[PDB]
Design a protein around this nucleic acid. Sequence first.
RNA 1: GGCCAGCAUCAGUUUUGGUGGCAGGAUAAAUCCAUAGGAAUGUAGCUUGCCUCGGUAAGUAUUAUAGCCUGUG
RNA 2: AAGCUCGUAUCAGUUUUAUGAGGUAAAGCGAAAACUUUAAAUAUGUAAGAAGUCGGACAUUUGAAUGAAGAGCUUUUAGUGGGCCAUUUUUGGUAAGCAGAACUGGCGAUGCGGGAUGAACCGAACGUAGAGUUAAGGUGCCGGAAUACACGCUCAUCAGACACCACAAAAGGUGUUAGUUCAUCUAGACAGCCGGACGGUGGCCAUGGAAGUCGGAAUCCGCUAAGGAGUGUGUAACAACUCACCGGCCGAAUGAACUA
RNA 3: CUAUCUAGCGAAACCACAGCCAAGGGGGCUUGGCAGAAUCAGCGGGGA
RNA 4: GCAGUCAAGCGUUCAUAGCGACAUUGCUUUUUGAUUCUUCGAUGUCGGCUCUUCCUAUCAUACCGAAGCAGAAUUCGGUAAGCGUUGGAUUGUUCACCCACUAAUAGGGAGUGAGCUGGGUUACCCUACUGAU
RNA 5: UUUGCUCCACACAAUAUAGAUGGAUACGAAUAAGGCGUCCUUGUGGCGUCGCUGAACCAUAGCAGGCUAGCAACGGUGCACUUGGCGGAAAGGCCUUGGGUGCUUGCUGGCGAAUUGCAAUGUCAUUUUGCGUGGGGAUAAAUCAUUUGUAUACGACUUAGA
Lengths: 171, 191, 234, 165
Amino acid sequence: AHFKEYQVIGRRLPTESVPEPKLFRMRIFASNEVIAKSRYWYFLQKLHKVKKASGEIVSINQINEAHPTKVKNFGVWVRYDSRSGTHNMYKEIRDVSRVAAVETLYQDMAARHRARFRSIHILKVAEIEKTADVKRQYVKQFLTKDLKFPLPHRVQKSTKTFSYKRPSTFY
Amino acid sequence: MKYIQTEQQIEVPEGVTVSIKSRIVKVVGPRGTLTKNLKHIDVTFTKVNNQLIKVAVHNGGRKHVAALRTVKSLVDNMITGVTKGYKYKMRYVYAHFPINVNIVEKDGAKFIEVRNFLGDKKIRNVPVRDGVTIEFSTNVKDEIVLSGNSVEDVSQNAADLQQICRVRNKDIRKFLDGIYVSHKGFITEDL
Amino acid sequence: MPRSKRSKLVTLAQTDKKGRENKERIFDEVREALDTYRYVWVLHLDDVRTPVLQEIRTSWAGSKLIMGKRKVLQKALGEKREEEYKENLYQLSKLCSGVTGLLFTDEDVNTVKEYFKSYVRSDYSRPNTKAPLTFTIPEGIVYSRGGQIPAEEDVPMIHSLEPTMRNKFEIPTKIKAGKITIDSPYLVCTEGEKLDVRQALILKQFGIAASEFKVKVSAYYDNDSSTVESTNIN
Amino acid sequence: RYAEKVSMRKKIKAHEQSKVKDALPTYLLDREQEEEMFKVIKTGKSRSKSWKRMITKHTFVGEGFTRRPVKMERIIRPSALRQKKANVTHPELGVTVFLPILAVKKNPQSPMYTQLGVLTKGTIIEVNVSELGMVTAGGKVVWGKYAQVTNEPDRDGCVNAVLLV
RNA sequence: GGCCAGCAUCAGUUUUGGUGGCAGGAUAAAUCCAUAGGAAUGUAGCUUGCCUCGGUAAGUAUUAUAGCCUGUG
RNA sequence: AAGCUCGUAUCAGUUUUAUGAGGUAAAGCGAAAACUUUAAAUAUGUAAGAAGUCGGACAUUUGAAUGAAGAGCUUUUAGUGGGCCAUUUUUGGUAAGCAGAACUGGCGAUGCGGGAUGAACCGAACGUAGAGUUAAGGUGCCGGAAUACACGCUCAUCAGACACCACAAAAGGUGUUAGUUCAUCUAGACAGCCGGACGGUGGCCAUGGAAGUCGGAAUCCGCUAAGGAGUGUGUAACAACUCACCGGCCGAAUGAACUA
RNA sequence: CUAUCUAGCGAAACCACAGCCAAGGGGGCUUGGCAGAAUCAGCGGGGA
RNA sequence: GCAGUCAAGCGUUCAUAGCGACAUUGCUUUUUGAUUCUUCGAUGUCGGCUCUUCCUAUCAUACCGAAGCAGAAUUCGGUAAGCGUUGGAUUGUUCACCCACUAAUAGGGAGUGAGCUGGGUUACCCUACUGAU
RNA sequence: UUUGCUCCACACAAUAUAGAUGGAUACGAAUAAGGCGUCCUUGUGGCGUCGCUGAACCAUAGCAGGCUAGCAACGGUGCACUUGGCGGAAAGGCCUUGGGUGCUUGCUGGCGAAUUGCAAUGUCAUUUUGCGUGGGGAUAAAUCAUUUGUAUACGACUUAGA
C-alpha cells in the first residue's frame, strides 16, 4: 500500500550441538509487519535450506530515515522473474527517501514491464553522494545550475459543470 | 527519454526584421516580406537580443523536438529567401520536337503554356503562384529561370512543371526528352 | 533514440580499425626517437601526396619523417614545460598548429633548409588557395585537358562524367553524339581570387596540377644545444 | 525479409571466417550421393440388403489377383490405391532410390492388415535391391531386404522407407 | 373519546462530525542549538579575457559579502 | 414409524502421536552416482484404555486435542438403480482433438445479486416487513455510485476495454519507453565537410579486350598516420569517383547486439 | 367471361397470444435501428 | 515426405542426454522441346435454366510502378468491385470439352426442401414489399 | 345566425402544468495565450494592471409589502402613451425621443398589523376553454350529387357547370 521499510532477523532454531545459528538479517520493504515476515521466509527458503517451522524471528523494526528531506540520488539493483527466466536491472531516482523511491519503482515496473510486486525482488538500495557517476540521464538533467522550468498549460479543476468565462490556462 | 528542455538558435542579421506574435511570423527584409502561420506546432519563441532568437520546447517527446529543429530550418529558409532570394533553373530538352514554351496572363493568372510536346497538339497550362517571377533564358539556349522569395512556392511550381511531362507508357530510357531542373541556387551571386 | 534511427552501412572489407594501440605505439616510438636523433624539424604540409612522402623518405633514410595525429604528437612532445621528454619543447609544441608532420635527423641544418627551398613539385589548387592560371573552356567539343594541347591529339571527355558536370559543376553541358559539347564558352576562374571547391574540382577533372607545391617550415630544435629555433621559410 | 537478413548474417559469418586466417570398391565408384468401426450401408430399393464393406486405405496386392465374382464378395478393394513402388533411402550415404515392394510380412495392429497389405507406419516390408548390386560372401546376388516405412501413405502417396542395415 | 402530525426527555439499533487525555517505537526519526570534519551543480574574495563595463569563460578560493553535506552531543 | 437399555453413553467425511505391507534419492557420505544405503510424502491400517494393565491386585486427570450429551440392537414401511461438466492423480496415445480408469465437487429436486442475455462462471444459509453493513461486480451517460487522487506507458488508414498463457506465432517493422552485455573517446567518440587513400603491380593463367572490380585461383612484401593481390559505380579496355583506413576543422558523448 | 364495385343471400379451413428488423441468447429476453390513427387492391418471400 | 548438411537458439549441465527454425543435397514412372485408348470393375449420387443481392482474392474497363518495355502488342505487380462479364454442339461410363464472336467472355455465398432432367434412393389469415386513400 | 364568426375590456367557471416561485447577467480568437485601461509614431507597438473561479455582477427592507408627514436631490424605476431608428437565422425583440402618471429604503418622523392562537404550499405564476357583461369588426369557401377525361381497379386525380 503506502510503504514502510523493515529490519528483520531470523535465528534458526536451536538444535542440540548447534544452538544459536547465525542470525540471518534482511532489510525488507512492505506496508506492514506480517507481509514483511512472509517475504523474509520466502527469500530465506530460496537462499538456503530453511522452513518457517525450522526457523524463528528475532525482531521487527521500522527503519526510519536519518535525514529525510535531504534530496538524494538513489540507485537500485534489482531482479525480477517476469514470464521469462529471471533477470537483473538497475534504476536511478532523484527522490527524498529510500521507501518512496521503491514506491515509484514498483509502479514504474508495473507500467513498463507489467511487473508484479510478488515477482519483484530487490537486491539492494544504494545512495550516491557524489554526482556524475550516476549512469542515467533522465535524472542527470535535473542536476544543472540555476535551474528553472515552467508548468505549461496549467488547468484548474472546478467542481461546477458550467463556467461562464471562456477559460484559459496561463500561459 | 522525455527530454526536459530543447532549444535551438536562429540568427537574425542586421538588415532584416521579424515580428512574432503568438505563433504567427512576419519576416521583413530588403527584398521584401513574408509571413507564415505556425499554429499547429506548439512551441515557444524568445528574443535574447536582436542577432539571435531562441526556439524551445519543454517536456519534449521525440516528435515534438524533431519538429523544433524543423521549424528553425523553415524560418531560416525564409530569411535566406529575403536576403538572398532563391533561384531555380531548368532546361527543356527534345530529340525531335521543339517545345514551344510561353507565358500568358488570363485575367491576371500567369499561366505557363507548353505546346509541341512530343508532337502533340495539346496545350498544357501550369499556374504561377504569387510571389514568384519567371524569366526565359536570354543568351542561353533551351533554359528557363525562376526566382522568388518563397522557396516552397518556387520548388512546388517547378516540381509541378516537371511532373507535367511525365511521359507515360513509354520507355524512359529512350525518351530522354523532358523538362528538368539544372540547379538550385540563390539569386545572388554575389551574396 | 531506440528506433527510427539511421542504418549505417555494413560491409565485409578487409581493413580493420586501429584504436589506441597504434596511438600509444607511435607515442612511445617518437619518445624512442627523441634521444636517438639530434636535429628536429616541425613540418607544416597541408597538401600531401603519398608518393611525395615516400620519395622524401627514400631520399633520406638516415633521416626519419614521421606523421600522425596531432594531439598525440603534442602529447609525446609534451605540451607543458612541466611534462616533457626533454627541456625547451613546450614552447615549440605551442606553435605546431597545422598539418604536422615532423622529422628526426642528425645532418646539417643548412642542407635541409636549402633542400626544401629547392624542392618544388606541381600539385592542384587545394582551395582556400590561389591557382596561378585562368581557364576558359571553348564552345566546342570538350577534352580531357580543356584546351591545353592541340585539338587533333586531345581525346574528348567520356560520356559517363557529364551528369556530374551538370550536378556538381553547375555548367551547361549538352550531349550531341558520343563526345561532349558545349554551347557557350565557360571561364572557370581568374587570377588573384581564392579558388572555390568546385573550381578546384574542375581543374582536377581536367587533371591540371597548375599550382606550385613547396613545403614551408616554422621552426627547428637541436637536442645537444637543447634550444629552439624559429624559421619561416617556404 | 527474414531470408535476406539471414543470408546477410551468413555473409558476415563467412567474411569473418575468411578474415580470421569412402573406402568403396571400384564398380560402385562414380555414383552421386464389429459393433463399432462398421457402418451398415443398406443397398437397393428395399433397404435391407446391405451385405457390403469397403476398403478406404492403401494396400499392395501382389502380382496375380484373380478377383472373385460380385455376388459372393463382401469386401471391396478399389483399384487406384495400389503401390508397386516406394522410395527407399539408405541410412549410410543417405541415398534415395525409388524401388519396388515385393511383399509385406509385418503390419501392426492386426494380423489382417498383414495379408491385406496396408502400408501404414510400423509396417516392415520386403524390398528389392537390384541396381545397387553389392557382392556378398560367395558372390551371390541380393533380391530381397527388409525396410521400415517412415511416413503415412494417406498423407502422401510417396512411401519413404529406411533400409534395415 | 377516532384520523394525521409536531416539540422535549429516555431506551435498543446505527450512521456521521468535533474535542480532550494516555502508551509505544531508535523512549520516534526529523526540524532546531552548539560542536568537529568534508566537498561542490564552488558563496565571498583573487587572477586572466571581453566589454553590453558586469555578465559570461577558466582557474583560484572550503564561508568569507551565500550556503550545503556528514559525525557526535 | 414404532418399541426397550439409557442419555449413563455414543461417536465424528477432523487434527496430534506412534506404525507397516512401499519409495519417491530431489542427500551420495554408505564400494572406484555406483548404492535399498531410507532428508521424507503420497495415506491407508491401527490405536490413544475396565472392551485396559500383570486365581488374585488397580476407578473416572481412567490415559491427546476439538465438537456434538439425540446414539445403538431387532422388527416393519414409501420412493429410488443411472449421467453431462469440472478439478486432482495416472495408463494409453494423436498432427491435433483426445480415449480409458479412480477420487472429489457442481447441476439434477434450487430460487436471488452480478456476469449486457444464458445449463456449466463469480458471490450467497430464502418465512413476511423495517433500518443498518457488505460480498462477487462496478462508479463517464443508459445505471444507483468519485469526469476521484496519483506514477507510468499507448495515439492503431476500422486500436483496446479478454476472460490469458492460446490459436494463427517463429519472426517481420527506420513507432515508442525502459533495461542488459560489449565498444569508443578533449591523449579529441558519432555525424559530417577537406586531403591522402601509394609503389613492385597492368601479380598468374586466362583474352579480341580484362589495368583493384567479364571472370578461375592466389592473400605478398615495400614505405608506411594509413592505404586490400584490392567494397561499389565504371568505360571496349584504361581513366575518374566512393568506402574500409588514416589525417585536418568542430567540440561531446556516442555506437553494435540482445531482451522486455 | 370473371377479377373490381354495388343491392340481396352467405360459409369453411385455421385459431395459446399475436405480430416491425440486425447482432447476441452455448417471434417474445438483452442491446440497438425505427415505429403516427384507421385502411383498400395486387403480392407469393415466411408463418407453434 | 523421409534421411542428411549450418545451428540461430533451447535443453538450468550433455550440442550425437536431446530438441531444433530459415536455407540446402538427396529420386520421386521413359533427361535431349525423343514420349502410355491411365477418362479401363466406383451400384456410388450429382448436374442444370431464368431473376435478385452480396464479397473480391480483378477477366476486361480507369490510373500507376517495374520489366530490354525502340514502338504497336504483351508478362508480372499495386489501388480499385462504380459498371460489365456472350451465343451455340454434346451422356453403355460428356470429365471436362471443342466451335466461333466479344474489351473480357474471372471466382464464391444466401437462393426454388414449390416448376424441370437422370442407370437415380389456407401461399386468403398477419408479416414485410409494390402501388393507393 | 333565432344574432353565428372575429379584435379588445372584467366576472365567474372549469381546464390542466415532465414542474417559475429575485434575474437565461450577450463580444470574438487564442490557450506554448489573452483581456481591461492608458500613451504613442496606430502597430502583431509600448507602459501599467488583471485572472489562479460566478465562493461573482446586478436586484434586494416597507401588510406578499399599507396610510401619512417631511429633508436632500432633479437621479433612478414602474405603467399607459408618443417620436425616431435597428435587427430576417426560427426577426416576434432591442434601442431611443418627449412628456404625463405614480413609487422611490438617498435620510428622519408618526399610525397599523395581534387572534392563522408553538408549524402544516398556506395558495399571489402561466396554458387552454366556455358562459355572461360592453365597445369595435365583417359578411365565406369546401364537399356530395352532375359532367368531363390529359388520369382512371373502386378511392383518388385533373376539367366545366348560376
